[PDB]
């Protein structure tokens, strides 16, 4: 409060100590939306007891989970999908506007432990199926968990049995088109720019307003100070408090109404990824687009990124019925 | 400790992390870097001249873009009056003077007690007269060898009829015969018509009185608006790794001075950037690019593992490296990526976290220390996949949780 | 004998320094896209060209020509002795400034005889009661023997006068910035402006603006350069 | 211990300062009810599906496999009791597709 | 802002620019909640090819 509103003066903070206390209310309520975005990635991630690991030797049937687990040599040990989603967000005077003392925090969970969390899920997922997130791990084979789900729609096991190849090929070709998707088309990170770009253009009017004299001699507090009576100036210095101490509320007011739709989209993920991914689902056009099969997650800079798998129908005919 | 029971305004402290106060390094050294490239103000061609002007009839002079200092008459002038008003004769060589005028004349050896305000006198009602609300200096000094002649000297004249009284800073040369009597002058000199202006005599061996003097009155503005007749300090040249006080030719702050490669253009002298503020300045002695850095900011909050159970607390300095600030304003020094922990240790195993601190790592209470450590994420366990293998369970159990929603909070009014 | 200028005439207004910033200010130009007025001074009849025009805010004067025949312009209120004038000539010699109460005649204009070498004087009868003078150092330039351009801006508030000049070598489609060069305060009254030119032993271009209040935008460079500048009232 | 034309100045910051400091508490106070009935529509989604009935979706009503529900009243809110079922002692074998 | 707060007289349009950018930024509000409206008629119906 005093470091923005009365500079490196003396004079200036016996006058402001006649307003009442209104630093401590404007420092208590910035104070609470840095807990509460700490505690929002607790609750999207932090939903697994143990880690897991994958077994040396691939052998899943045909599928080729190649491109969304980690490989050692890029630093993080990230995978080559979360890899180029980082170059597309783009984090963009930070370096010296720090004059009138505005400061920003780190974040808890440093960006390696949520590497952590996402490659567990992924990898537990696999050999196990649905049973890790219900109890204890209990292995099975890939092929026949791919039947276990292919029964949960209505169609049989003879044929998922009869056409394996096939749905293999089917599902390596369908992954490998994203990754052109993506690396080409540098705007499908789309909503995940404007909660930075809102955050910082509002920083910036703070800032400029600090140079806009409201009804005095001038906008620096030493030419009202130099050149004027003593008893004179405390009746102009009492003009730029309330002009300076109005735009310090109005900034308040609108980060806590932002900071509230924040919330509700981050309580939307933690069921998403608690029912798309730990389970099969039966709500129509939840988890995608279809008939549900699988899902897998991905990390991404200030947000999360999933691929659903579905079911479609095709090559239909004409035929005759009747009741009995 | 204490603070933060002054703080929260109680004699009990939980468990938590509190951020108490501030954190600021006050600048020592003031310095003026005075702006004094120009040349001298014309000292020698306001005081000694050829030729002064008379009382009735003085002169007017503007000296502006140069630099106070009056040293050199020292050697030469020998004054007879020096009385200030408004201003103190020892702080003239660390102020300012704006729109600074001299005048000039020739007045008697008696007659110069009436340069004054408030006074009266044959000068001070018809030739010069001073405002009540004066600002300056009057010097008067001696001129007798150079302004006496054998014969008398009959150049120097003054006013002696006159209709009423002047005003300050108000210059009559109009010459008229004066009517002292009921009956018209129509013009003509005659009874009771005299000539207004007199002529002065002086002689080579007059009385100490009877000499002539010459005086220079100076006035002058004090801090009110910008000034090109200034006074050095010159105690330029400063430290370049230190937070000091600096005053250039427009602009005053505080910070750390260091030389930039950037270039100046001739016709520019600050330096700005996207937003309004003040990151560079020109040398005007040297002609060299300097810079502007903070050094006085940060925050400091205290760390307690709950306020009966212990006495000892650790302090954490927000964004500070461990070389400014000093271990107690040590031998417990710890450096994260959120500040600089002091007060505790570095250990090796790794625990859940207890309370969060920034960057992945924690503290908690642990006879008993205080521990730094960082937090695991969990155990380990791997899963034994094969193609040809399964697992089914042979038993079960029961469990029971619970579950706590908030539903409504309490209804008030005001009048 | 009418031409507008496309986007030419901007002088640096502040005294800072900034890099890649596309800060807009709000000052005195003359609008894009405005036509201004054409003179000619040529011998085949021959033609000589010195009026009298108005000085409202400001002119943006610029001068074409292979030799240089235009040496000054004549300043004040009515130009007699009655009212002071600043008075800027080259004669040749040295840069001649002086303000005084002159007495100009109807046409003062300097001349040469052949080789060249000046032969007349012809400007004023009686300047007195005057305080300022200043004389620009002596020099030397030579005589006969379009390529260049020279343009330059006049201002006159709070009692002061500000030229901003550049040289660069009817007009062309460049575009340019302007610096200040000179600064002398005078605290006078000035309504109207003259020009005058010499004349090669015989008897009998240029062009004349204004400005308006109007915002511009101002894109500067790493080097405090200022490259490009688009107005904000020409098209929607 | 003023008169009426002098001391109408010195009360006209009063009234305006504590009239700044009322809308304040206001507007803080109409943020706050907007977060609590967006729990009190989740409770009563939770005793519609986890209490009248049995449900399917993981992860809504406890953890492991939905049996029942049981609630209880608290001052200002509620609190539910869920039973389920865990499974444990596992075993190995082996397997084969037709 | 311009026209509500003080009419149209130029004595006001004056001393309204030392305020800062108080009316531009109230006039961005009552425009991203004013597209949000047209977004929201747009979920609900449109769920069909
Ligand atoms: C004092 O601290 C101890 C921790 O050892 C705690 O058990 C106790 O409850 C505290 N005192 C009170 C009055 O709570
Ligand atoms: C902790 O690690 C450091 C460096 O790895 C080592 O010097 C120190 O001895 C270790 N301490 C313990 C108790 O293992
Ligand atoms: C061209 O000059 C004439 C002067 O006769 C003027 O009326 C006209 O507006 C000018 N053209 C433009 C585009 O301004």
Request: proline fraction near 5%.
């Given at each position: 409060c005093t470091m923005y509103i009365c500079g490196d003066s003396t004079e200036c903070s016996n006058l402001l100590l006649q307003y009442g206390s209104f630093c401590t209310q404007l420092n208590r309520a910035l104070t609470g939306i840095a807990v509460e975005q700490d505690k929002n990635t607790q609750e999207v991630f932090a939903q697994v007891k143990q880690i897991y690991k994958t077994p040396p030797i691939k052998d899943f049937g045909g599928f080729n989970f190649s491109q969304i687990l980690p490989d050692p040599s890029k630093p993080s040990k990230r995978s080559f999908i979360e890899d180029l989603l980082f170059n597309k967000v783009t984090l963009a005077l930070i370096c010296a506007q720090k004059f009138n003392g505005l400061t920003v925090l780190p974040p808890l969970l440093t960006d390696e432990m949520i590497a952590q969390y996402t490659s567990a899920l992924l990898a537990g997922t696999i050999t196990s199926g649905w049973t890790f997130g219900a109890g204890a791990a209990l292995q099975i084979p890939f092929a026949m968990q791919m039947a276990y789900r292919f029964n949960g729609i209505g169609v049989t096991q003879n044929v998922l049995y009869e056409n394996?190849?096939?749905?293999?090929?089917?599902?390596?070709?369908?992954?490998?088109?994203?990754?052109?998707?993506?690396?080409?088309?540098?705007?499908?990170?789309?909503?995940?720019?404007?909660?930075?770009?809102?955050?910082?253009?509002?920083?910036?009017?703070?800032?400029?307003?600090?140079?806009?004299?409201?009804?005095?001699?001038?906008?620096?507090?030493?030419?009202?100070?130099?050149?004027?009576?003593?008893?004179?100036?405390?009746?102009?210095?009492?003009?730029?408090?309330?002009?300076?101490?109005?735009?310090?509320?109005?900034?308040?007011?609108?980060?806590?109404?932002?900071?509230?739709?924040?919330?509700?989209?981050?309580?939307?993920?933690?069921?998403?990824?608690?029912?798309?991914?730990?389970?099969?689902?039966?709500?129509?056009?939840?988890?995608?687009?279809?008939?549900?099969?699988?899902?897998?997650?991905?990390?991404?800079?200030?947000?999360?990124?999933?691929?659903?798998?579905?079911?479609?129908?095709?090559?239909?005919?004409?035929?005759?019925?009747?009741?009995? | 400790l204490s603070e933060t029971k002054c703080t929260l305004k109680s004699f009990t402290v939980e468990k938590g992390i509190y951020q108490?106060?501030?954190?600021?390094?006050?600048?020592?050294?003031?310095?003026?870097?005075?702006?004094?490239?120009?040349?001298?103000?014309?000292?020698?061609?306001?005081?000694?001249?050829?030729?002064?002007?008379?009382?009735?009839?003085?002169?007017?002079?503007?000296?502006?873009?140069?630099?106070?200092?009056?040293?050199?008459?020292?050697?030469?002038?020998?004054?007879?009056?020096?009385?200030?008003?408004?201003?103190?004769?020892?702080?003239?060589?660390?102020?300012?003077?704006?729109?600074?005028?001299?005048?000039?004349?020739?007045?008697?050896?008696?007659?110069?007690?009436?340069?004054?305000?408030?006074?009266?006198?044959?000068?001070?009602?018809?030739?010069?007269?001073?405002?009540?609300?004066?600002?300056?200096?009057?010097?008067?000094?001696?001129?007798?060898?150079?302004?006496?002649?054998?014969?008398?000297?009959?150049?120097?004249?003054?006013?002696?009829?006159?209709?009423?009284?002047?005003?300050?800073?108000?210059?009559?040369?109009?010459?008229?015969?004066?009517?002292?009597?009921?009956?018209?002058?129509?013009?003509?000199?005659?009874?009771?018509?005299?000539?207004?202006?007199?002529?002065?005599?002086?002689?080579?061996?007059?009385?100490?009185?009877?000499?002539?003097?010459?005086?220079?009155?100076?006035?002058?503005?004090?801090?009110?608006?910008?000034?090109?007749?200034?006074?050095?300090?010159?105690?330029?040249?400063?430290?370049?790794?230190?937070?000091?006080?600096?005053?250039?030719?427009?602009?005053?702050?505080?910070?750390?001075?260091?030389?930039?490669?950037?270039?100046?253009?001739?016709?520019?002298?600050?330096?700005?950037?996207?937003?309004?503020?003040?990151?560079?300045?020109?040398?005007?002695?040297?002609?060299?690019?300097?810079?502007?850095?903070?050094?006085?900011?940060?925050?400091?909050?205290?760390?307690?593992?709950?306020?009966?159970?212990?006495?000892?607390?650790?302090?954490?300095?927000?964004?500070?490296?461990?070389?400014?600030?000093?271990?107690?304003?040590?031998?417990?020094?710890?450096?994260?990526?959120?500040?600089?922990?002091?007060?505790?240790?570095?250990?090796?195993?790794?625990?859940?976290?207890?309370?969060?601190?920034?960057?992945?790592?924690?503290?908690?209470?642990?006879?008993?220390?205080?521990?730094?450590?960082?937090?695991?994420?969990?155990?380990?366990?791997?899963?034994?996949?094969?193609?040809?293998?399964?697992?089914?369970?042979?038993?079960?159990?029961?469990?029971?949780?619970?579950?706590?929603?908030?539903?409504?909070?309490?209804?008030?009014?005001?009048? | 004998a009418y031409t507008n200028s496309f986007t030419r005439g901007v002088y640096y207004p502040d005294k800072v320094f900034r890099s890649s910033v596309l800060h807009s200010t709000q000052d005195l130009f003359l609008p894009f896209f405005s036509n201004v007025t054409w003179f000619h001074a040529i011998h085949v009849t021959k033609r000589f060209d010195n009026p009298v025009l108005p000085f409202n805010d400001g002119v943006y004067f610029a001068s074409t020509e292979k030799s240089n025949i235009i040496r000054g312009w004549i300043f004040g209120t009515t130009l007699d002795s009655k009212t002071q004038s600043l008075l800027i000539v080259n004669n040749a010699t040295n840069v001649v400034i002086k303000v005084c109460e002159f007495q100009f005649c109807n046409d003062p204009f300097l001349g040469v005889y052949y080789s060249w070498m000046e032969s007349e004087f012809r400007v004023y009868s009686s300047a007195n009661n005057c305080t300022f003078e200043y004389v620009s150092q002596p020099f030397l330039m030579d005589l006969e023997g379009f390529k260049n351009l020279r343009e330059f801006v006049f201002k006159n508030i709070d009692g002061y006068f500000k030229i901003y000049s550049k040289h660069t070598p009817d007009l062309p489609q460049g575009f340019s910035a302007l610096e200040p060069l000179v600064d002398l305060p005078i605290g006078i009254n000035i309504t109207r402006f003259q020009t005058l030119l010499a004349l090669h032993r015989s008897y009998l271009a240029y062009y004349v603006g204004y400005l308006q209040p109007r915002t511009f935008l101002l894109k500067y460079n790493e080097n405090g350069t200022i490259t490009d500048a688009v107005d904000c009232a020409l098209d929607p």
């Amino acid at each position: 409060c005093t470091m923005y509103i009365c500079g490196d003066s003396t004079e200036c903070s016996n006058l402001l100590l006649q307003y009442g206390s209104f630093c401590t209310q404007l420092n208590r309520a910035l104070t609470g939306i840095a807990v509460e975005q700490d505690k929002n990635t607790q609750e999207v991630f932090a939903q697994v007891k143990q880690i897991y690991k994958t077994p040396p030797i691939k052998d899943f049937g045909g599928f080729n989970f190649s491109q969304i687990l980690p490989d050692p040599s890029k630093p993080s040990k990230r995978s080559f999908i979360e890899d180029l989603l980082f170059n597309k967000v783009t984090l963009a005077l930070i370096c010296a506007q720090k004059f009138n003392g505005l400061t920003v925090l780190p974040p808890l969970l440093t960006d390696e432990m949520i590497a952590q969390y996402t490659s567990a899920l992924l990898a537990g997922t696999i050999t196990s199926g649905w049973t890790f997130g219900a109890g204890a791990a209990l292995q099975i084979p890939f092929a026949m968990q791919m039947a276990y789900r292919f029964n949960g729609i209505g169609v049989t096991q003879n044929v998922l049995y009869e056409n394996q190849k096939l749905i293999a090929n089917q599902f390596n070709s369908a992954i490998g088109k994203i990754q052109d998707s993506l690396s080409s088309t540098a705007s499908a990170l789309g909503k995940l720019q404007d909660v930075v770009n809102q955050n910082a253009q509002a920083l910036n009017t703070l800032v400029k307003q600090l140079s806009s004299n409201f009804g005095a001699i001038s906008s620096v507090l030493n030419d009202i100070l130099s050149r004027l009576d003593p008893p004179e100036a405390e009746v102009q210095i009492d003009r730029l408090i309330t002009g300076r101490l109005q735009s310090l509320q109005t900034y308040v007011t609108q980060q806590l109404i932002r900071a509230a739709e924040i919330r509700a989209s981050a309580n939307l993920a933690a069921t998403k990824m608690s029912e798309c991914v730990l389970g099969q689902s039966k709500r129509v056009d939840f988890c995608g687009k279809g008939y549900h099969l699988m899902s897998f997650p991905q990390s991404a800079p200030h947000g999360v990124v999933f691929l659903h798998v579905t079911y479609v129908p095709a090559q239909e005919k004409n035929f005759t019925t009747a009741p009995a | 400790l204490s603070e933060t029971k002054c703080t929260l305004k109680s004699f009990t402290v939980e468990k938590g992390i509190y951020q108490t106060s501030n954190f600021r390094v006050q600048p020592t050294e003031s310095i003026v870097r005075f702006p004094n490239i120009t040349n001298l103000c014309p000292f020698g061609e306001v005081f000694n001249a050829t030729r002064f002007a008379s009382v009735y009839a003085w002169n007017r002079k503007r000296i502006s873009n140069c630099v106070a200092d009056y040293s050199v008459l020292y050697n030469s002038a020998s004054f007879s009056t020096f009385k200030c008003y408004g201003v103190s004769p020892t702080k003239l060589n660390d102020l300012c003077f704006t729109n600074v005028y001299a005048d000039s004349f020739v007045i008697r050896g008696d007659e110069v007690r009436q340069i004054a305000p408030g006074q009266t006198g044959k000068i001070a009602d018809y030739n010069y007269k001073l405002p009540d609300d004066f600002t300056g200096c009057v010097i008067a000094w001696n001129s007798n060898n150079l302004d006496s002649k054998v014969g008398g000297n009959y150049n120097y004249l003054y006013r002696l009829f006159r209709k009423s009284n002047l005003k300050p800073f108000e210059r009559d040369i109009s010459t008229e015969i004066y009517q002292a009597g009921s009956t018209p002058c129509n013009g003509v000199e005659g009874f009771n018509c005299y000539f207004p202006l007199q002529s002065y005599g002086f002689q080579p061996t007059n009385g100490v009185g009877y000499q002539p003097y010459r005086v220079v009155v100076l006035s002058f503005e004090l801090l009110h608006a910008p000034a090109t007749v200034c006074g050095p300090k010159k105690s330029t040249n400063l430290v370049k790794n230190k937070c000091v006080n600096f005053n250039f030719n427009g602009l005053t702050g505080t910070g750390v001075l260091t030389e930039s490669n950037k270039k100046f253009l001739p016709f520019q002298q600050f330096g700005r950037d996207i937003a309004d503020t003040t990151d560079a300045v020109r040398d005007p002695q040297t002609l060299e690019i300097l810079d502007i850095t903070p050094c006085s900011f940060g925050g400091v909050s205290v760390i307690t593992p709950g306020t009966n159970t212990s006495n000892q607390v650790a302090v954490l300095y927000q964004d500070v490296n461990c070389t400014e600030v000093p271990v107690a304003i040590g031998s417990n020094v710890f450096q994260t990526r959120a500040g600089c922990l002091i007060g505790a240790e570095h250990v090796n195993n790794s625990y859940e976290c207890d309370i969060p601190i920034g960057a992945g790592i924690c503290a908690s209470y642990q006879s008993q220390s205080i521990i730094a450590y960082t937090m695991s994420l969990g155990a380990e366990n791997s899963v034994a996949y094969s193609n040809n293998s399964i697992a089914i369970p042979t038993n079960f159990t029961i469990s029971v949780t619970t579950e706590i929603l908030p539903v409504s909070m309490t209804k008030t009014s005001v009048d | 004998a009418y031409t507008n200028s496309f986007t030419r005439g901007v002088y640096y207004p502040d005294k800072v320094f900034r890099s890649s910033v596309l800060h807009s200010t709000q000052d005195l130009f003359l609008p894009f896209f405005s036509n201004v007025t054409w003179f000619h001074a040529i011998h085949v009849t021959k033609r000589f060209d010195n009026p009298v025009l108005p000085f409202n805010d400001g002119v943006y004067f610029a001068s074409t020509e292979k030799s240089n025949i235009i040496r000054g312009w004549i300043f004040g209120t009515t130009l007699d002795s009655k009212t002071q004038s600043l008075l800027i000539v080259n004669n040749a010699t040295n840069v001649v400034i002086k303000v005084c109460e002159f007495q100009f005649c109807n046409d003062p204009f300097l001349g040469v005889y052949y080789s060249w070498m000046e032969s007349e004087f012809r400007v004023y009868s009686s300047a007195n009661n005057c305080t300022f003078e200043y004389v620009s150092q002596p020099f030397l330039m030579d005589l006969e023997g379009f390529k260049n351009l020279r343009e330059f801006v006049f201002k006159n508030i709070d009692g002061y006068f500000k030229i901003y000049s550049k040289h660069t070598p009817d007009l062309p489609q460049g575009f340019s910035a302007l610096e200040p060069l000179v600064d002398l305060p005078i605290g006078i009254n000035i309504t109207r402006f003259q020009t005058l030119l010499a004349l090669h032993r015989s008897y009998l271009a240029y062009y004349v603006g204004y400005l308006q209040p109007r915002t511009f935008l101002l894109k500067y460079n790493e080097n405090g350069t200022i490259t490009d500048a688009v107005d904000c009232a020409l098209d929607p």
